[PDB]
């Protein structure tokens, strides 16, 4: 196993702070379902029973 | 007229006197009052046999 660390922006002790910002826009992703409905069922008794 | 088993849903008056009953086997409505065993099913679509 290996879990990659996250960017390290280390913190400065003067009156400036460090910042790191992004370089470009690369956008969109796959999206999760949410499963709104279910199947509606109906059983004819005295036929299957 | 000839008398045979059958289930019926009978409504006794506060004197104890049947003036009102329904067949089962007879039309599919009569199957819905059973079933509720109430002389009122409320309006809908309704699976039968």
């Known amino acids: 196993i ?6 390290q922006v280390d913190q400065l002790n003067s009156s400036y702070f460090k910042l790191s910002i992004p370089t470009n826009f690369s956008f969109g992703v796959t999206q999760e379902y949410i499963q709104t409905t ?12 | ?17 049947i003036r009102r ?3 089962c086997g007879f039309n599919d ?6 079933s509720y065993e109430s002389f009122d099913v409320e309006s809908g679509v ?4």
Do not use: E, M, R, W
Not at chain 1, 2 to 7: E, Q, T
Not at chain 2, 2 to 17: A, E, I, M, N, R
Not at chain 2, 46 to 49: A, K, L, N, T
């Open chain 2, 46 to 49: 309704y699976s039968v046999s």
């Open chain 2, 1 to 17: 007229y000839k008398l045979q088993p059958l289930t019926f849903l009978l409504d006794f008056s506060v004197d104890g006197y």
């Open chain 1, 38 to 49: 279910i199947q509606k069922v109906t059983v004819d008794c005295k036929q299957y029973v």
């Open chain 2, 29 to 34: 409505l009569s199957q819905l009052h059973c």
């Open chain 1, 2 to 7: 290996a879990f990659n660390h996250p960017i």
């Open chain 2, 21 to 23: 009953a329904i067949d």
